[PDB]
């Protein structure tokens, strides 16, 4: 069977925390007062919750209320424990309250509001400087949550809220996040298709924080090349073929061989033989203002099949790509 794997960083953060910290199943939720919040408008309904803009009538502040769909008490407590553990961290969305919705009879998670613009339009206008700036802000959140023993597992543009006026960013939607425990087998059905790492797509379960770095590499490629999404699979199988058309099939075999993993035999008809492409292949006169040798080297170091070889979040904040970004 499969060769085991361990994160190369923050490997044992949870093993040395008290049990209270990671044993979310024993968490006792503290409930606030649902009459504090008045719903103003419904923004959307996603897989797990109905999302509203609301007003906290005790301070007249705008807030975001996510009224959860029926789900396992376990998964509610996991997201709530993770949000409490991370609260106040760099660029981590703030959970302001947890209340029982009287109509749905489920928990409603109340979050600080961020004055966002639709990433689809926002990514059309980001300058080279802005891409570097915001990548650095996302890395602050990822290094923090990884250092706190947690992987996000759903990094994508829709979960990055940006208030462009104030150049403020928050990483949101921690409902797929999990505590990292060395040697633990995780569910591979996480993240959203275009941002799934190769480990997910080959059903390797002993993955770690490095999954988020693949997803961040997918966002970066989409931004610097103005190609949304960058790996545009029609389904989870074609997703791996699209990746192989860029990174090549020989290194995909080397990856699966290293972990003694076998592809689904359904790949035998669809995968083909592909060389690794040079990143210059995706540059053209409409995105070249976003591309630099430092951007391409950084991307190359995120988008590795082998999850063990990817830059960690801290290593990524050390990269030359971020030298031009003004630090505070």
Curated annotation (Swiss-Prot):
All copies of domain Protein kinase, residue ranges: 37-322
Keyword line: Apoptosis, ATP-binding, Biological rhythms, Cell cycle, Disease variant, Intellectual disability, Kinase, Nucleotide-binding, Nucleus, Phosphoprotein, Serine/threonine-protein kinase, Transcription, Transcription regulation, Transferase, Wnt signaling pathway
Tissues where the protein occurs: Expressed in gastric carcinoma tissue and the expression gradually increases with the progression of the carcinoma (at protein level).
Any Gene Ontology biological process: regulation of chromosome separation
Catalysed reactions listed for this entry: L-seryl-[protein] + ATP = O-phospho-L-seryl-[protein] + ADP + H(+); L-threonyl-[protein] + ATP = O-phospho-L-threonyl-[protein] + ADP + H(+)
Key word Nucleus present: yes
GO molecular function: ATP binding; Hsp90 protein binding; identical protein binding; kinase activity; protein serine kinase activity; protein serine/threonine kinase activity
Active-site annotation: 154 (proton acceptor)
Residues annotated as binding ATP: 43-51, 66
Compartment list: Nucleus
Mod. after translation: Phosphorylation does not directly affect casein kinase 2 activity, but may contribute to its regulation by forming binding sites for interacting proteins and/or targeting it to different compartments.
Mechanisms controlling activity: Constitutively active protein kinase whose activity is not directly affected by phosphorylation. Seems to be regulated by level of expression and localization.
EC number of the protein: 2.7.11.1
EC class (word): transferase
Predominant place of localization: nucleus
Record's GO cellular component terms: cytosol; nucleoplasm; nucleus; plasma membrane; PML body; protein kinase CK2 complex; Sin3-type complex
Source organism, top-level taxon: Eukaryota
Family to which the UniProt record says this protein belongs: Belongs to the protein kinase superfamily. Ser/Thr protein kinase family. CK2 subfamily.
Disease: Okur-Chung neurodevelopmental syndrome: An autosomal dominant neurodevelopmental disorder characterized by developmental delay, intellectual disability, behavioral problems, hypotonia, speech problems, microcephaly, pachygyria and variable dysmorphic features.
Subunit structure: Heterotetramer composed of two catalytic subunits (alpha chain and/or alpha' chain) and two regulatory subunits (beta chains). The tetramer can exist as a combination of 2 alpha/2 beta, 2 alpha'/2 beta or 1 alpha/1 alpha'/2 beta subunits. Also part of a CK2-SPT16-SSRP1 complex composed of SSRP1, SUPT16H, CSNK2A1, CSNK2A2 and CSNK2B, which forms following UV irradiation. Interacts with RNPS1. Interacts with SNAI1. Interacts with PML (isoform PML-12). Interacts with CCAR2. Interacts with HIRIP3.
Function: Catalytic subunit of a constitutively active serine/threonine-protein kinase complex that phosphorylates a large number of substrates containing acidic residues C-terminal to the phosphorylated serine or threonine. Regulates numerous cellular processes, such as cell cycle progression, apoptosis and transcription, as well as viral infection. May act as a regulatory node which integrates and coordinates numerous signals leading to an appropriate cellular response.
Additional observations: Can use both ATP and GTP as phosphoryl donors. Phosphorylation by casein kinase 2 has been estimated to represent up to one quarter of the eukaryotic phosphoproteome. Casein kinase 2 has been found to be increased at protein level and up-regulated at the level of enzyme activity in the majority of cancers. However, elevated levels of casein kinase 2 are present in certain normal organs such as brain and testes.
Protein known as: Casein kinase II subunit alpha
The organism of origin for this protein: Homo sapiens
Full protein: residues contained: 3 to 330 of 391
């Amino acid at each position: 069977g499969p060769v085991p794997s361990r994160a190369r960083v923050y490997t044992d953060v949870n093993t040395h925390r008290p049990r209270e910290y990671w044993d979310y199943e024993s968490h006792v939720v503290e409930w606030g007062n649902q009459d504090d919040y008045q719903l103003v408008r419904k923004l959307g309904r996603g897989k797990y919750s109905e999302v509203f803009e609301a007003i906290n009538i005790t301070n007249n502040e705008k807030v975001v209320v996510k009224i959860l769909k029926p789900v396992k008490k376990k998964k509610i407590k996991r997201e709530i424990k993770i949000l409490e553990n991370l609260r106040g961290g760099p660029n981590i969305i703030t959970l302001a309250d947890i209340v029982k919705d009287p109509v749905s009879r489920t928990p409603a998670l109340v979050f600080e509001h961020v004055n966002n613009t639709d990433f689809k339009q926002l990514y059309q206008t980001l300058t080279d400087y802005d891409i570097r700036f915001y990548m650095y802000e996302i890395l602050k959140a990822l290094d923090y949550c990884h250092s706190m023993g947690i992987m996000h597992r759903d990094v994508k543009p829709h979960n990055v809220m940006i208030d462009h006026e104030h150049r403020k960013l928050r990483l949101i939607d921690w409902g797929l996040a999990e505590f990292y425990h060395p040697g633990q087998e995780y569910n591979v059905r996480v993240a959203s298709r275009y941002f799934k790492g190769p480990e997910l797509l080959v059903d390797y379960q002993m993955y770690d924080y490095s999954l988020d770095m693949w997803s961040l590499g997918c966002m970066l490629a989409s931004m610097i090349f103005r190609k949304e999404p960058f790996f545009h699979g029609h389904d989870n199988y074609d997703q791996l073929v699209r990746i192989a058309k860029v990174l090549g099939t020989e290194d995909l075999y080397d990856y699966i061989d290293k972990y003694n993993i076998e592809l689904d035999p359904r790949f035998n008809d669809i995968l083909g033989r592909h060389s690794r492409k040079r990143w210059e292949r995706f540059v053209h006169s409409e995105n070249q203002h976003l591309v630099s040798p430092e951007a391409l080297d950084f991307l190359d170091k995120l988008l590795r099949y082998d999850h063990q070889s990817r830059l960690t979040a801290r290593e990524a904040m050390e990269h030359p790509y971020f030298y031009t970004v003004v630090k505070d």
